[PDB]
Amino acid sequence: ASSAVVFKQMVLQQALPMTLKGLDKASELATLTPEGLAREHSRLASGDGALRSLSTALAGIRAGSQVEESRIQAGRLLERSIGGIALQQWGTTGGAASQLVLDASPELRREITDQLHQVMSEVALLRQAVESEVS
Amino acid sequence: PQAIKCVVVGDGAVGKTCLLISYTTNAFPGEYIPTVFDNYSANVMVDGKPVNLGLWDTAGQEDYDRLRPLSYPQTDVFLICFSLVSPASFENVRAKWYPEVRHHCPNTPIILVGTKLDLRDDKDTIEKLKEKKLTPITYPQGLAMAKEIGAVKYLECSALTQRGLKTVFDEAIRAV
Ligand SMILES: Nc1nc2c(ncn2[C@@H]2O[C@H](COP(=O)(O)OP(=O)(O)O)[C@@H](O)[C@H]2O)c(=O)[nH]1
Ligand SMILES: [Mg+2]
Ligand code: NI
Ligand code: NI
Ligand code: NI
Alpha-carbon torsion (B64, B65, B70, B71), positive or negative: positive
List all residues 6 or more positions away from A79 whose beta carbon is below 8 Å from its beta carbon: A86, A87, A88
Closest residue by Cα to residue B117 from B19, B6, B17: B19
**B19, B87 in Cβ contact below 8 A?**
no
Measured in angstroms, the resolution is 2.0
Question: Could you identify the atom of ligand 1 that is nearest to the CA of residue B158?
Answer: 27
Q: Angle A50-64/A3-14 helices, nearest 10 degrees?
A: 130
User: 10 Å Cβ neighbour count for B48?
Assistant: 5
CA distance linking residue B144 with residue B150, whole number of Å: 10
To 5 degrees, how large is the angle CA A62–CA A64–CA A68? 60
User: 10 Å Cβ neighbour count for B26?
Assistant: 10
CA A73 from chain center: how many Å? 12
C-alpha of residue B66 to centroid of ligand 5, in Å: 10
Question: Could you identify the atom of ligand 1 that is nearest to the CA of residue B13?
Answer: 17
CA distance linking residue A24 with residue A16, whole number of Å: 13
Does B158 sit in the ligand 1 pocket, CB within 6 Å?
yes
Amino acid at residue number B92: N
**B22, B113 in Cβ contact below 8 A?**
no
N-to-C CA span, chain B? 14
N-to-C CA span, chain A? 31
Q: Which residues of B113-127 are buried (b: 16+ CB within 10 A; e: fewer)?
A: bbbbbbbbeeeebee
Inform me whether the C-beta atom of residue B125 falls under 8 Å from chain A C-beta atoms: no
CB–CB of A22 and B13 under 8 A?
no
Inform me whether the C-beta atom of residue B91 falls under 8 Å from chain A C-beta atoms: no
Chain A residues inside the 8 Å CB shell of B60: 47
Distances in whole angstroms, Cα of residue B123 to Cα of each of A92, A98, B81, B85, B94? 20, 16, 23, 12, 28
Closest residue by Cα to residue B55 from B99, B104, B17: B17
CA distance linking residue A109 with residue B148, whole number of Å: 44
Determine if residue B16 is labeled as part of a ligand binding site.
yes
Which region, left, alpha or beta, applies to residue B150 given φ > 0 means left and ψ of -120 to 50 means alpha?
Answer: left
Domains contained in chain A, CATH given: 1-135 (1.20.120.260)
Q: Which residues of B65-96 are buried (b: 16+ CB within 10 A; e: fewer)?
A: eebbebbbeebbbbbbbbbbbbbebbebbeeb
Using DSSP bridges, classify how beta strands B153-156 and B49-58 pair: parallel, antiparallel or unpaired.
unpaired
Structural biology method used: X-ray
Domains contained in chain B, CATH given: 1-176 (3.40.50.300)
